[PDB]
Design brief:
Blueprint: E1 3-11, E2 16-18, E3 23-26, E4 28-31, E5 40-47, E6 55-63, E7 67-75, E8 82-87, E9 92-98, E10 103-112
Parallel strand pairs: 1-10
Antiparallel strand pairs: 1-5, 2-6, 3-6, 4-5, 6-7, 7-8, 9-10
Subunit structure: Monomer in solution. Copurifies from parasporal inclusion bodies with Cry35Ab1.
InterPro entries: Aegerolysin-typ, Cytolysin/lectin
Organism: Bacillus thuringiensis
Amino acid sequence: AREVHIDVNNKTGHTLQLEDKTKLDGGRWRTSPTNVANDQIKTFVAESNGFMTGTEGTIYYSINGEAEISLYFDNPFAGSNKYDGHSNKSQYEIITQGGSGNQSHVTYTIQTTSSRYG
């Protein structure tokens, strides 16, 4: 019973549309991902359900015909948890901070990309 709690914080300027391709490679959804409104935070939760396995998956969101977001999480059996957030268009950026442990928590902040000085 490893669990992964997921906060998705939408700061994109648009609605995050959940894509059907969203998938759990291991485990099950206690609370499953939904669309998330601009300037909104929602929490989704996944449960590991077997012997010496863990929870692992990727949530995919669409930014209104404009871009694809991928949020990966892994709370393995033994090991370090792993997480990543990626945007297929340079105009969006994901901040990823997630927990260590067993009942773990990760927050993905989907934001507008900033321009770096000089």
